[PDB]
Design an enzyme around this catalytic site. Structure first.
Site, mmCIF file in Angstrom:
data_model
loop_
_atom_site.group_PDB
_atom_site.id
_atom_site.type_symbol
_atom_site.label_atom_id
_atom_site.label_comp_id
_atom_site.label_asym_id
_atom_site.label_seq_id
_atom_site.Cartn_x
_atom_site.Cartn_y
_atom_site.Cartn_z
ATOM 1 N N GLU A 1 0.829 -1.212 0.000
ATOM 2 C CA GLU A 1 0.000 0.000 0.000
ATOM 3 C C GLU A 1 0.864 1.264 0.000
ATOM 4 O O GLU A 1 0.560 2.262 0.675
ATOM 5 C CB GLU A 1 -0.975 -0.051 1.186
ATOM 6 C CG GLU A 1 -1.972 -1.193 1.029
ATOM 7 C CD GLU A 1 -2.904 -1.432 2.203
ATOM 8 O OE1 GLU A 1 -2.958 -0.618 3.156
ATOM 9 O OE2 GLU A 1 -3.612 -2.471 2.159
ATOM 10 N N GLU B 1 -5.053 -8.350 -0.793
ATOM 11 C CA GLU B 1 -5.998 -8.189 0.316
ATOM 12 C C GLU B 1 -7.373 -7.943 -0.276
ATOM 13 O O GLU B 1 -7.490 -7.302 -1.316
ATOM 14 C CB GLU B 1 -5.634 -7.012 1.223
ATOM 15 C CG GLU B 1 -4.363 -7.170 2.015
ATOM 16 C CD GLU B 1 -4.143 -6.043 3.021
ATOM 17 O OE1 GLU B 1 -5.091 -5.272 3.290
ATOM 18 O OE2 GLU B 1 -3.017 -5.934 3.546
#
Ligand SMILES: [Ca+2]
Ligand SMILES: [Ca+2]
Ligand SMILES: [Zn+2]
Length: 332
Positions: free
Chosen positions: A167, A266
């Site tokens: 991220e 994810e």
């Protein structure tokens, strides 16, 4: 063809698993590995999500995830934030027909400890990259403890989906951007330096040959491929994807365009029916080789469609990786 791990010295089992993963989208069934995050080591990690899924579906996730780094914690020494005690369960998961995945919510080596979501300057980021500085020593202290943990798994020949520095196109973690969707070319360059530093520490300095390297930008931010450290440093690319509508996730074309196996690294409700997610994979994201549902409110066991997700003909679950002493056959 043969897809090889980017680490040319990778263990044979890791080589064989990586090639096998890359050929999954040639199949008509058992072509997307299920996955669940089990929690943070010595904090929330347990087998409880796996067991909830068995109870609801009769099946277990192919992939089980642990995170070693509790980077919010204030500790006397920064590396105290790292715990690897989930290894026992991860090794058993492999022995019982699944695969482990490890991520790191790293404490921030710009500071004494903790502060995983406290931003830093590019100057501080350079100090971190310099092994001679107080900051660089803190980073190396963390990397060394992580490698000690990974070594345990390497000693039993266990391949690991290793997903560091995720991220990075978000604005929350210390290693990524400092500001929402705001390009910073020096930060992007510095990120690649840090990724490569970790790659060479794990691979050369510590000789870890059981790692499959995963690059996982956020699906809800720009610059998904700008941070890509390159074809020689990444085995699998993927999206951390939190969404309300499974059919409008952004980034599949950009990431698959890198010609690497693609995963939903994810997944969860943004706030939800997981049966719609597997359906969306078939229509919109067919090259997906795995998904990893997050824990707590995001998990498959606490949302709708767990059974449809797990019993879908495309879904490859724990026990469907091996046929006896060899992997299930590759479709070329
Ligand atoms: Ca080794
Ligand atoms: Ca199946
Ligand atoms: Zn092939």
């Amino acid at each position: 063809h043969t897809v090889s791990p980017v680490n040319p010295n990778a263990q044979q089992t890791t080589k064989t698993v990586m090639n096998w993963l890359a050929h999954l989208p040639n199949r008509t069934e058992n072509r997307v590995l299920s996955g669940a995050f089990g929690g943070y080591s010595h904090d929330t990690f347990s087998m409880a999500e796996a067991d909830r899924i068995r109870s609801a579906t009769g099946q277990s996730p192919a992939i089980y995830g642990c995170d070693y780094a509790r980077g919010w914690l204030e500790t006397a020494n920064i590396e105290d934030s790292i715990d690897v005690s989930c290894n026992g369960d991860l090794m058993s998961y492999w022995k019982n027909g699944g695969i482990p995945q490890i991520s790191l919510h790293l404490a921030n080596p710009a500071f004494q400890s903790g502060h995983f979501k406290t931003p830093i300057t590019n100057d501080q980021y350079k100090n971190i990259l310099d092994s001679a500085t107080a900051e660089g020593k803190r980073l190396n202290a963390m990397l060394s403890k992580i490698a000690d943990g990974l070594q345990e798994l390497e000693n039993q020949g266990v391949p690991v989906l290793f997903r560091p520095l995720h991220e990075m196109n978000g604005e929350w973690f210390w290693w990524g951007l400092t500001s929402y969707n705001q390009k910073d070319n020096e930060r992007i360059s510095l990120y690649k330096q840090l990724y490569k530093k970790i790659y060479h520490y794990m691979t050369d300095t510590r000789g870890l040959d059981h790692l499959i390297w995963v690059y996982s930008p956020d699906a809800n931010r720009d610059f998904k491929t700008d941070f890509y450290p390159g074809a020689s440093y990444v085995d699998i690319v993927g999206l951390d994807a939190y969404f309300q509508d499974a059919y409008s996730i952004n980034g599949y074309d950009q990431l698959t365009a890198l010609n690497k196996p693609f995963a939903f690294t994810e997944v969860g409700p943004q706030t939800f029916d997981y049966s719609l997610f597997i359906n969306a994979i078939k229509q919109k994201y067919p090259k997906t080789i795995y998904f990893l549902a997050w824990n707590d409110e995001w998990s498959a066991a606490v949302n709708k469609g767990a059974s449809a997700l797990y019993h879908d003909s495309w879904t490859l679950n724990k026990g469907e990786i091996w046929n006896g002493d060899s992997l299930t056959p590759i479709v070329e």
